[PDB]
Design a protein around this ligand. Structure first.
Ligand SMILES: [Co+2]
Ligand SMILES: [Co+2]
Ligand SMILES: [K+]
Length: 282
């Protein structure tokens, strides 16, 4: 199977005009980066709805993953699930991004753009979709195997999922945030994988990336302590090869330099009074 190259982007999909757009839609930048890391009880409850809807759109698109299908089609299905449930797709028009989710096949680390690319037997594909509803965001992603995937790649996918869930089960108020990236990296290194460093989880609430940064590698210099009401993502990208990457001219698609495949999972999490709640479940 060759290295991917760009396919052709289908026309911008429309969303019902009654669905409220994030402020950043049709603007070159987003007004985000300085919002409180601990959300209000109101915002938390609204984020459960947004999380649930983003989890539904992810599951629907993942069901369509099969040799034969375009990435564009995965986007059509996610887009249509979000819209039928009253949500705006947060990626759509976010910093000029053209689609309603990110589709990252094989050696694409992240930020892949749904297009005419046809998925083949043995490929892996991450689908990352976010929902904006009631003024808040819910963000989730999963890598899905297509047909008959090599054992090397099923293991990568299974172990990326496992790293993410292990990190999720470390979340508790009063525990250092830096715990997350230590658990992830330590598990990935056990199988000789390398954790992408330059892309991170983020705080999320009324804004998409609110300024809080969640590292997926061991970085004990971070002093941030987890507090009840904090909402953020854990979304580690794990590479079979070297971390070195390139960005396509589209200004978005990140691909590994050696072309070895890479996988990712993502939940939106709430720090509760005693532990964690995953908001992006069905
Ligand atoms: Co995401
Ligand atoms: Co995210
Ligand atoms: K990938």
């Amino acid at each position: 199977r060759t290295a991917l190259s760009p396919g052709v982007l289908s026309p911008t999909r429309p969303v019902p005009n009654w669905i409220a757009r994030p402020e950043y839609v049709g603007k070159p930048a987003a007004q985000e980066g300085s919002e409180p890391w601990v959300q209000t009880p109101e915002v938390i409850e609204k984020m459960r709805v947004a999380g649930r809807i983003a989890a539904g759109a992810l599951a629907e698109a993942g069901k369509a993953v099969a040799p034969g299908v375009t990435t564009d089609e995965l986007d059509r299905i996610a887009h249509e699930y979000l819209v039928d449930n009253g949500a705006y797709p947060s990626t759509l028009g976010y910093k000029g991004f053209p689609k309603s989710c990110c589709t990252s096949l094989n050696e694409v680390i992240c930020h892949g753009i749904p297009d005419s690319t046809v998925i083949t037997d043995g490929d892996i594909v991450n689908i990352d979709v976010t929902a904006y509803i009631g003024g808040v965001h819910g963000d989730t992603n999963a890598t899905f195997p297509a047909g008959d995937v090599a054992d090397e790649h099923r293991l990568l996918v299974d172990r990326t999922r496992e790293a993410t869930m292990r990190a999720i089960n470390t979340v508790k108020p009063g525990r250092a945030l830096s715990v997350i990236g230590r658990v992830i990296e330590s598990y990935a290194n056990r199988f000789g994988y390398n954790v992408v460093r330059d892309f991170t989880g983020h705080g999320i609430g009324t804004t998409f990336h609110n300024g809080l940064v969640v590292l997926h590698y061991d970085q004990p210099a971070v002093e941030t302590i987890m507090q009840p009401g904090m909402t953020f993502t854990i979304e580690p990208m794990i590479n079979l090869g070297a971390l070195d990457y390139e960005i396509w001219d589209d200004g978005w698609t990140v691909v590994t330099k050696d072309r070895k495949w890479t996988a990712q999972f993502e939940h939106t999490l709430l720090v509760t009074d005693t532990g964690v709640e995953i908001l992006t479940c069905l």
